[PDB]
Amino acid sequence: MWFEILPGLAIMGVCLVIPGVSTAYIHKFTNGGKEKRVARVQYQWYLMERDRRISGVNRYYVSKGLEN
Amino acid sequence: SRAEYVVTKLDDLINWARRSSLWPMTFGLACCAVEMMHMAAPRYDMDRFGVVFRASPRQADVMIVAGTLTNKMAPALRKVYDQMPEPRYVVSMGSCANGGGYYHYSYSVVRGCDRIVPVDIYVPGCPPTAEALLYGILQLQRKIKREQKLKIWYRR
Amino acid sequence: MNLYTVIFINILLSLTLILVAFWLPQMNLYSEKANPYECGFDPTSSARLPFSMKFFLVAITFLLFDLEIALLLPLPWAIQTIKTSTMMIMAFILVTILSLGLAYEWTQKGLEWTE
Amino acid sequence: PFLDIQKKLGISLDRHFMFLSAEQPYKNAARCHAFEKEWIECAHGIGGTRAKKECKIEFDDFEECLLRYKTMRRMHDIKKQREKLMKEGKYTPPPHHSGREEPRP
Amino acid sequence: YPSKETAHWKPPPWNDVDILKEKAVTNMTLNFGPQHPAAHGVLRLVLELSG
Amino acid sequence: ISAFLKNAWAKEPVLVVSFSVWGLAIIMPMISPYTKYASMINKATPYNYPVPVRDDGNMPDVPSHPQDPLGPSLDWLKNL
Amino acid sequence: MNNYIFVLSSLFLVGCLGLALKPSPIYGGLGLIVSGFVGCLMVLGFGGSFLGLMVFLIYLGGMLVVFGYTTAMATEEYPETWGSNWLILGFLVLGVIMEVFLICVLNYYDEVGVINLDGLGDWLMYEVDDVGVMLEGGIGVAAMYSCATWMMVVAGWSLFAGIFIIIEITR
Amino acid sequence: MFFINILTLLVPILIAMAFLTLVERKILGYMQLRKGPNIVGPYGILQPFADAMKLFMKEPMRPLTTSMSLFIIAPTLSLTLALSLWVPLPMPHPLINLNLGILFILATSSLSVYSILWSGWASNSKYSLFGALRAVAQTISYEVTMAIILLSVLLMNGSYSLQTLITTQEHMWLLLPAWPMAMMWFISTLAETNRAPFDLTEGESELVSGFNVEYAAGPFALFFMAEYTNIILMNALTTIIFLGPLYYINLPELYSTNFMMEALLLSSTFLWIRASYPRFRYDQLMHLLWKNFLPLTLALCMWHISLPIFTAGVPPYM
Amino acid sequence: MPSTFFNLTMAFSLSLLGTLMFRSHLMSTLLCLEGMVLSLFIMTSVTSLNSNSMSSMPIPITILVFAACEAAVGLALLVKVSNTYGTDYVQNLNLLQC
């Protein structure tokens, strides 16, 4: 009957959730538990480049607080 | 373990994909093709067996020669049969295509498509019932189920 | 470099599949098979002969309408301009000008196909 | 121009973006804005056959700022000498020219 | 000032409308053959086309 | 002309909506009360640093501290 | 990495050289798209995003009509490719070898200036403004609607008039 | 760590499209009182695998009259473009961020047509040529309209990047203000991918198959690899551009779960339409989009040019 | 910047050398004009982006608006050329000899 279409869609629907959920989680794994910063203007790139050189480890996803 | 055993399973794998995706060709000549439509009709759906009709011979595995094959058409049928990429199968359908059928003694009928293309399965009748052709298609599927093409390759 | 990897990953994937398409299966070639298809019968003439179209007038005006959008896609950044009034007039005129050209093409049977 | 209609009517149809220092869309100074601003001020009233020699010191600066022919020839010379010293094993580059330094904020 | 180079030149027509050899229409021919699914069976329309 | 307007409406509606909205977009900006606010909002955005100006003792109307009441204000934007 | 724009420009030249040899228009369009696609890239390499995708969004639409037109008027029983004529292939390899000979020979005679083989990649950006917004390329194009409106009317008129020009020719 | 991310965007898409082939045959069949494939697996779940295997084990040919270079490069572009075109797609975080995201779509989506043109022309066949010379009419009909619609839709979003559309629809679907466009966008998108009723390049009745009558099993699949991943995409874009799902930054997983619900529902709709209407004639497609949609679309372009002006609703940049 | 413009200028020259030395087709010549403008468009684009001249950015757009209109007129002409000779060839445009 018509509900026999669900197997075609059920594991198809899973296959269209992986590309979305995976990217969000992969970003958080690589970027130290924070979202992937997005540079759409030169102002933001200067800020990431700043954080890349602020931190001793040359990575912009480690954030130094008020401890300097 | 023996290397022969792995070969057969691959042989059964390639055969299986060729059994459940048997695409015929929209090549109904006459008066059996009406019952070749009924095979495609709701009652005896061919999409159940992964059997889908495609117009181009380049994308057709089996050719259902359904209907009387005449002299004027004989050169065309062989040409179309040649275009189908191998492996290809032919399923002669009905009396007019198996032998000459009702027009065996006419001056412009080739007495059976077996004279022009090599036939794999013959489906008798006039017209064969939609089940009779479906039994032919299934009996063609069981033919691919026993090919032994990769098994002999190990023996060559 | 992230975007270079993706297309070259796709290119490799597409090449590998098509490469496996041509060397995996068993082939048996002869002249009758590789000839043009043309619905069972041998073609009377090649398919390279001049094949006249009849929508060439719409084909040309498609270019002018394609350049026409190139003058409209800057609108989202043009709205940010301090003026907001010169932009709007020069936006209506461009769209209105396209319409009048389309309207004249309409009445002259430009969009209709040569019989 | 051939017909001073734009000046006659006073309307600047297409004579406000002639050159780099010509009131960019937002207040973003075009590269070498100061240099060509200097050159255009020098050659005013003084016209054509008198600005090709009196304002030559400033045009050359504008020519250098835009094309940057001299900096490339200069920095090409530094690089060539740097490689020649390396081949003779007489120069060892400093830590901050090799990729290891104390980066500033 | 005729010479061997310009022996074959002719004056232009008075209305500037040359009588060009009327080209023969080379209309494409398509074997709308029997195997076509739109033939309702076996039927060959060898039909002249112009596009 | 009532028949022609509605006869076209009955037979070729698409060419009447296009002409109607075409005239509607031309006339709406003149009547709206917020049309003049499109320009001011695009004057508020400070994309470039507001360059300060020296004091000679004759610059009273510009503020001294950023948060002082003698300069331009955006209090109309918060309540638009 | 430094020799990234140079390789694109060289492919642009090779693609254009292939278009200069004038094969059948089908392949000329394919070569032109290769050059146009490369044209977008080198423009992107220079910090400009909007213009790059415009050369690649307008010439793409153009080649459909050229492809449509060439199959209608300019065709032969056997179209000419780059390898159909050995002379064309001869001037194709010669042209490819020609640039290398010109690119190399210019280097030795002139150390730097027009071409800088020894110093490459260093001379590509010229002092971006590190901190700043509204700098993204494409805002300048949007000036066509403000303090550059003369370019807008003249360009708009050509499209306006062109529709009339085309109809009369094809009447 | 990046290479792994491609797999989570490349393999699932291939699996999803393959299982769309079954879902098409099943949904179409049920609208026609047929049971689609239910013999290969428990419910045909193995049917797409069966079709995939045979085509890559069925001889592909090198026809005498064809052109090998274009005959082989055309399918590669179709799959390369159809797969690389999922890349800037936010779900809700795209694999790469593009400042001009949709323009990437237009150029690449318009670049997919050259697959049909070169495929038809390279395969020196009359029917293949007919398919090629219908994609030109297919594209000349919709490209002028599809670009203007997207301009109008985004003009209340401000930028061109896709991921700003999520922020745009934080509180309301962009369908509601622009449901006129969403209808024109739903047809112009149906023109691309050559999905019925605008199924003319791969015409199966007027032409035997259409730009495919010379592609044997191997390269033939490469076109279906692309012809259906492009169906899921323009449904993916439409649900991102018009049916904006919930973002909820702290819950990225909720966007994808809601996204898939609409993308499948829209995808079931292209297959649903194929099961209901007959096919256009490619002149009527040209007239339909140039006598009806182009007038109204241009008129609506003016309407949305003034909408932020007489409402003070100019969207921001950045 | 310096290395790439030598390649762009010679790209124009090769396209210039192509639109002069004709061949046996007239579509090909129009395609050569496309490459010439393609070289010209990118040079203006790079120079504007190189010098950060955002006021000169509108110019490269206008070249495309007019160069592509030359193609539109050029293609329309070629329709009339073929409808009177049916071959598109260039050596059929020798009827003005006298």
Ligand SMILES: CCCCCCCCCCCCCCCCCC(=O)OC[C@H](COP(=O)(O)OCCN)OC(=O)CCCCCCCCCCCCCCCCC
């Ligand atoms: C407040 C002031 C501002 C107000 C501004 C707004 C004004 C009101 C606007 C109302 C109109 C909305 C937009 C209308 C778009 C449709 C245009 C149209 O009329 O359709 C064109 C065509 C007409 O039919 P035709 O036979 O050509 O008529 C003339 C014959 N000589 O008909 C067709 O195209 C039919 C062929 C296409 C069929 C495709 C099948 C579609 C199946 C239904 C799926 C719909 C799904 C929509 C949801 C998608 C979600 C993403």
Ligand SMILES: CCCCCCCCCC[C@@H](O)[C@H]1CC[C@H]([C@H]2CC[C@H]([C@H](O)CCCCCCCCCCCC[C@H]3C[C@H](C)OC3=O)O2)O1
């Ligand atoms: C990437 C992974 C691999 C991808 C694999 C690709 C798989 C392909 C997918 C195709 C699939 O997705 C479905 C969807 C719907 C589509 C097809 C199926 C069937 C249907 C066909 O169109 C034909 C229906 C007609 C059936 C009757 C045939 C006999 C007619 C014989 C002619 C003569 C008759 C006379 C005589 C009488 C007088 O009157 C006549 O005229 O739509 O394919």
Ligand code: SF4
């Ligand atoms: S065998 Fe019978 S049903 Fe079949 S074509 Fe002949 S007469 Fe008709």
